[PDB]
Subunit: 487 residues, 4 copies
């Protein structure tokens, strides 16, 4: 049941009224990325409040293409009340740790498709396609020969199955359509046609809306304001109105968590005018970059690469993309060069568009496997880790091993795999592991190729004949005078 | 061997120099729709001329997501020189008929994937997905149990394969990545970052660019002008520059064929302030609409529905979408409400987005199958016909009862046949199916067949005649003009009298 | 002595640092209108703070083209600290009453040019013209044959002079240039090039900047943000950067007083989707309008005309302009049709551009002179009252017949005076003239006086009572309440019954 | 009598129908500048055609704020049919030489107000101000003590009068309001509200519309297209619709003469990515520039300064303004920084806003007076010459020392006069003064005369020769070629060697 469009106008309701249309066991899809990006907060809030006050609705399933929240009690963490959620499928998990706590305690069924694949299966679902065939995730925990993307004991049902085409290895991910969507835009007209002029980006708002709509579901959309019918520029409209069933107006909608007023640099409308360890790793990771290369800097210790490039005066010489869609820009970015929808960005990543990718690691093993989705008994999920480390041309892992000077000190077989060293070699990709103290490469036979100066050399890694001390410049609090390799 | 990017700048070349980068046997993907929409004309012209002069390159494969050209010698027709093209996969075939001539004569390998599916497989190819699973096409010529999308005898290889998931039948369409793209935008910066502010629409420019790029191919993009680096609005940039390898600047780039200067109504930047058998059909088709319904703008005899709605004062009460991406608007539309990329539009169509679907028909058989992709010995191809007739809630076929110069006069509230068509369209068994009556009933759909003299509905026991035009004889003008006998409804009535009167009907649109 | 441009960049300072560049006896010009419109609040606040703390700078002269503030302690009230200002020339005095207090108590030299004339003289001063010649103000207190615009006893120097050209009388207003400007924009680039995309309007920001710049003065500009050199759209730039000497950035800059977030309907970027005595006057005033006429949004009892016209469904048949530049719109208005600079708006008014103008009155005398600039012991000033009442085609004064705790009921299609007002507004002779009955008649203008109980028209032999409210006695409620004897029109009629009925009047707007 | 607005809609007519509304002896004001900038060509064309065909209307007065045309038969040259025009006031005359021919031949009454003053008197007329007071033009041919701005024998009525304020001399220029306007914009809505998004600039379109409107006249506006009411951005609207009486829609409207399609760099929407005597002068002119200074380069031998500054690497370190309103930019110009209305630009100029100005000369006399409005028996007029040379801080005259097929070659770091000019330009006494040496010295301005072979500076005792070109002989090439004796500076020196070498100079811009 959904409210009728009186005189063709989309129903405008309060968040409280809107969430009362969600029935028991509905499948709820939540648009958004970290730190409030494109998040319909009033809808999440009103739902959490309704279950707190009435213990309804019951046993919902959640689909979260990416990780919402503040790595604490925001995002979808408020929906982690027992009996509200029974089932969850997310591209990233640690960003709303109250949800992943439940999965950890076997309280809910829990899957993790790669974030890229997951948004693709929503787009498939919009078109009533049963699933998608991808080699993304072969040889990692999402492979049914391993965990099948299941995150805990209680998760039984198979969603991913192995298939064959051209006598070759592919995964088939089942496409699940949601019943309910919490989406958001900046502005919409009286018929629901929506533009995103002040939003940080687009994510997969249109895909989510289509997937829900074509499932006979209810799309609920939060906006900051509404305008007169047919007055928005048709080339700015990202969501056609007939896809939207309920609009919630939040006049105090903020681009990000924190309630700062609209920033038009962030909107994209104007052009804006310490030698620690993180920086050292950042610094060294930049050595892997070249002119004309398309890269991606990951969530974590790598994030400082752009700043190092700016300092070394080579930032314009290459381009860094963001998995959620923004291309280029400086530190939400400003002065971006383009913004794609999230799904299309992953389309680009899957076919090996990235020349260089920079990823964090929680654990590494003797086979060159990398673990990030699970560490210390806690569920993080992948985010876009697998989308990016599967087919990218050069893969640069970054993190601490546990003149340099190691004050207070603290690389293992992995209980679960997020990146397969073996699959990477067979695809013929160059793999690095950059550390505070030493730098490895992966080979058929992990070759130590470099070690930190001021240091002394669960498994034994080969050793390079060229085994060297890392660039000295890397260790002075001055300008490295770095030069970006040619194209 | 794409040319290097001097200091980050995308190489700018003449169309002539750009096509010299096309080697023998390359797969060429051509962006564009009918009448010049988003067509990189100079790049087509440069390849056609290079072949005319040198007989190189040779044995190219062509992918055309939709039909380019003017139903004559424009579009990719200039590419139909013998030896240039050996293989072609197109969403529509009649728009560049010189190419469909080669297919007709078995000179080339020729496939017709449904247009929507086709552009989705290109998107799949960008992600290096092997193919897509879809039930779009089941029980029609694209089904391997029928023709498997092959258009002639010479076409042998199976690209479409029957598969099963969740106890359901689906088709697996192989995804093929191109090596070369002819794409287009209005403007790009010095690094290739491209906007479409004056383009009629977007189509699947980005998808093609990604598909070719990730296949190690060479993306060639025509633009009207180039601007300083990083001065375009990031939210207007549809194609990131690292996807583009060669830019061709054509200062005389036109929005459509014809050479007309830029029309900023067509651009989207400004708001703009005869009763014959075609209007007749359009009028009766509008009766199928309701308030709040989502329909498609039809190609052919259905194209008059918008104008009739405007005349009847109900145009604002429902929404018509164009297959290639535009949504709403009036007569290139102006005053559109949104423009989606073509692929997303078909995503929406395939999931049953349309409440009402309006399509032409060349032929209808006794099972209520419909044919448009082949007739009169010619290859027309699907366009989006299968993408839209597969899962729309109401499927409304529109056309005259006979073909071949049918002439009628509407006078005195009557239909008068002054010159009958030479060809029967309502035949016994379609040689080849574009739409399955059986599959529509299975999917629970509501099927109408509107003609100028009669209206039918598809039931389980076949076509029911439900309305007959005043002025027309049931036996001589209908039964005699069909190769099968339809069930005659006990509820058979005269077509609404207001339909045949040359004044506004005072039509009231049914409630949502 | 101004700060140097380092590397071609306009210096950016804090408000506190910026105002240290203001010497003793500088002439300071303050941009802005009521309730925070285009007000450089940080600069005013900083100047005020510096004086409070240090008792410098001293003996400034102030130019305020219009009235800033909230009729209380905001606007330039902070600048009324004894010793800071010695001299002020303002188009409006009541909006910052702490300053008007200083004038009333004879503590400063105080002048009132008509607001429109005032901004034209600043524009003259930019060009180094010594003054302007205008008939605006002839026959009023700004006429040197009365008060010469001087507001108190201590003000002596004649700024206004009577002159003659083509055998006609004109005023010559002396053009005075300021030394300092406090201006504002939404955004500027690194060289000071400034746009107004989120501002309520433009006022005379460019004119002020030019007048100060060409006087060797210091232009200080508050903005919300700054952007990269040469990245703003050239057609959006209202102030060339070389006119700006100091930029202050206030990222919390608010469109209006009250610190609300930017409202994009107010910016102009998006299109927005009880019968008391004030409504009665507004209703009767609406009868003076006709299709296609241009009027002015009035301030006071008139300002509900727009809302009455919307209730009656004729709001789109004519157009209301705001003296400060905005044209059209609804209740900062939204959905405006245009925004002119303020000086240009007044050029239009002065040449008789208004078909109809609506104005409040505090007092009317027997010659039909109207007084608003001073009354009840207080200095209010003119605003644009004189610029508008000087030459508009129809001049419609609106107000109640008596004042001070007047209470009326509109019941049973009647006016009932439950409590008569204390103060008679219709007096024998104005102490000071803001509008001249004599001059308007010389100019051939149609002058109305609309009260809740009576309507008059100015003729050669004085006010003619032309209409009287139902429910009111001629002798007791009108004649005994005026200090002169109006002529009774032989066609004396009841005011239209519909005015006093709490339902839509079915008013039909007269034809163009 | 204007045609009625139907339902509030501005009448749309053909140019032919539109000009039919012009009666005999109407005063016609024509918007536009050189080369088709903002020219309502269809309206000029249609008025010219009508007179040719009908010898009506008769005896029109013309006001042309600046010079329209191509120095031949375009612009208002088609209006030169004998008996159509009897009277003309223009800011520049040479641009439509068929009209200036009529004046030379004494067939019409003919005046030249300085271009800036002229546009300012139109603005004054909008406000019903009788005229303006300005010292712009004192001591020149526009000064009544000389020619009072009258260009021939038949012109007798005094429009300009000497006056006095504050013990200083000023000119009083009569403000004349036109009866008809030919204006132009890019786009307007159905009520006349007009945007200039693709126009080269704005000029004084609004001032013209207000002047004519407030004179009971008819405002005719050519546009490229029309749009639905109230859909234009209110901050983009430059002309309120109620000022426009007739619209003529020309879908083929072109930004400039020559019919090129719209150029969006010229619109302002996008950022665009030989050693001879003229380059020599431009180079020596550049020596006069300083960091952060505001200049204007004039049409003529100086116009190469921008390109030189780009070649030398200092183009971004100062700003050049165009008299008609555009600020900054490169070769119409693109990448502009701002565009002002023309009148405001001249306000800025009149108040001494220019640090440096570059102007051409046709003649110089022993007093350092300069002539350009008449020479060789032809009326050229002033353009902005007087507005710019009257008060700018530094005035740099640029030209050759002789005229009349002068041929020079620059070789071996020397100038070589290969064929000496026929005509001496440095003469004993100017027949008529465009710029006065005395007044400039009285105003304390720095005055330079740069030629290809010699540089002079103005002083109390006349011109000082301060620099001489290498390769040139003082006596034979300079003294023998002037009809007066200059002071030879004791500090006389060779002109910078670098000027004369066919490589970048390594010029470094001084900061004062």
């Amino acid at each position: 049941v959904k409210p009728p469009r009186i005189n063709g106008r989309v129903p405008v309701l309060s968040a409280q009224e809107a969430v009362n249309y969600i029935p028991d066991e509905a499948t709820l899809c939540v648009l958004g990325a970290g730190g409030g990006i494109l998040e319909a907060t009033t809808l999440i809030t009103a739902l959490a409040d309704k279950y707190k006050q009435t213990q309804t609705p019951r046993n919902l399933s959640i689909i979260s293409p990416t990780g919402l929240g503040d790595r604490a009690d925001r995002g979808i963490s408020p929906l982690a009340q027992e009996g509200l959620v029974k089932w969850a499928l997310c591209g990233h998990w640690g960003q709303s740790p109250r949800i992943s706590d439940l999965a950890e305690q076997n309280k809910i069924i829990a899957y993790n498709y790669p974030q890229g694949v997951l948004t693709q299966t929503l787009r498939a679902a919009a078109a009533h396609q049963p699933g998608i065939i991808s080699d993304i995730g072969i040889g990692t925990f999402v492979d049914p020969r391993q965990q099948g993307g299941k995150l805990n004991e209680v998760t039984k049902e198979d969603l991913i199955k192995l298939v064959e085409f051209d006598n070759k290895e592919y995964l088939y991910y089942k496409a699940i359509a949601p019943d309910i969507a919490f989406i958001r835009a900046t502005t919409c007209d009286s018929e629901g046609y929506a533009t995103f002029e002040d939003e940080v980006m687009y994510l997969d708002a249109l895909v989510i809306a289509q997937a829900v709509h074509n499932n006979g579901g209810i799309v609920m959309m939060q906006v900051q304001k509404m305008v007169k019918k047919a007055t928005l520029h048709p080339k700015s409209v990202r969501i056609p109105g007939y896809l939207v069933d309920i609009v919630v107006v939040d006049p105090d909608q903020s681009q990000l968590y924190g309630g700062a007023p609209v920033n038009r640099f962030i909107s994209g409308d104007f052009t804006l005018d310490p030698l620690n360890q993180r920086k050292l790793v950042a610094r060294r990771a930049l050595f892997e970059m070249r002119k004309g290369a398309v890269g991606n800097v990951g969530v974590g210790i790598a994030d400082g690469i752009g700043l190092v490039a700016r300092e070394e005066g080579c930032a314009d010489d290459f381009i860094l993309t963001v998995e959620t869609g923004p291309i280029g820009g400086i530190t939400a970015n400003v002065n971006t060069r383009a913004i794609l929808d999230m799904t299309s960005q992953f389309d680009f990543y899957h076919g090996g568009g990235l020349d260089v990718c920079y990823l964090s690691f929680a654990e590494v093993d003797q086979h060159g496997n990398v673990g990030v989705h699970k560490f210390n008994g806690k569920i993080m999920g992948t985010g876009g880790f697998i989308d990016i480390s599967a087919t990218s041309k050069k893969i640069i892992f970054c993190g601490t091993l546990t003149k340099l000077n190691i004050v207070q000190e603290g690389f293992i077989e992995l209980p679960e795999i997020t990146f397969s060293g073996k699959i990477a070699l067979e695809r013929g990709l160059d793999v690095r592991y950059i550390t505070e103290r030493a730098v490895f490469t992966l080979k058929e036979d992990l070759h130590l190729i470099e070690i930190a100066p001021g240091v002394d050399l669960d498994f034994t890694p080969v050793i390079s004949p060229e085994l060297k001390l890392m660039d000295e410049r890397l260790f002075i609090d001055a300008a490295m005078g770095f030069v970006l390799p040619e194209a």
